[PDB]
Amino acid sequence: TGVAPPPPGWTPPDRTPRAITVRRLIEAPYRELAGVIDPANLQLLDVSASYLAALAEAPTSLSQSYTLTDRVGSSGAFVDRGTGDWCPTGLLAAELPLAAGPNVVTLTNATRLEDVTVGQAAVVDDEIVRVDAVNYASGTVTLARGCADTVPAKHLAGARVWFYDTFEAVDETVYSQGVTLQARLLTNTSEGQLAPALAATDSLTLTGRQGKPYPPGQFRINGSAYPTKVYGALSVSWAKRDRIGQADQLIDTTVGNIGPEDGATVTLQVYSGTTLKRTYAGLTSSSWSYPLAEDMADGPLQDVRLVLRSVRDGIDSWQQHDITIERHGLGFRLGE
């Protein structure tokens, strides 16, 4: 015959669950525990308590959710901990400079951008930010830098942004700091569940993120934020943050003092670029000036490294500020 029969049949859907390619593990900060745990149980929680959470991206539109499997250490049998939904995420088209306050950033390859809502908590790399505005069509959002227990940091193009707020899979079991876990994420579809053998593995080391005190907030030097130019006298201003008072509220660095925490102080380290020269601890004020006594002893420090952190009962904050500033004025940089 001449005519031939073409393929068209039913074209069955290709469910065939795949393993998750994009994912991440994190430690839940005090912000979520404050708003998800009742005060009676929360107050009894020790400073060393830690909680685990995971985030993932849907590999195909035919997958609804994924299952969480984890175990303690590198040995033992995985115990099912629950299922979670997909976390909206995107890629930064341009670098995010170190600057406090709102910043406009364009996102590429954004997923589930429609479901994002203002006021949510977003985490990238190791910085937690708050969304101020959203543009559905162009994927441009405004992010508040240095929020909760994080500080601004350089993020190269291609960094992944996760809007974990209300989109995270949480294991209710409490784990102490220093324990290493191995967990896997199994995709779930109407055709069934992904076989564990094909699931990627990962490990995380707990650090008691909720236990550590928040670092200082508004970090302004001589009235400027992260300045490379200071004319002589050195003035550094910092804000006092109390985790208990803030509770679930996201407060950025631009906000003023919110009071201190019981037994929480501020410690500052002074370096000569590589070497440690002076160290001031027990600071309770909102500003500090380099005493004139050590100016001649250390002499002119054109390259000065400023390190700021909060410590209570010998517990240092997970993150800290660190920048090398350049001094100008009389006696400073008269080679020009």
């Binding site: 998800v36 745990i37 009742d38 939904d85 989109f167 995270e168 949480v170």
Partner: protein, 48 residues
């Protein structure tokens, strides 16, 4: 422990279907599903 941060009570399903109503038609007036008037109107040219 306590009320979960969020609960997945249901799923929203999205489908894209292409269908034909037969030969050339002049005007589409309304769409009715399950006894409820989903949309009523009139269109006479290709459009959204």
């Amino acid at each position: 422990g306590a009320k979960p941060k969020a609960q997945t009570v249901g799923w929203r399903y999205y489908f894209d279907i292409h269908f034909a109503l037969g030969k050339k038609v002049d005007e589409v007036c309304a769409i009715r599903a399950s006894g409820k008037t989903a949309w009523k109107g009139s269109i006479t040219s290709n459009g959204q």
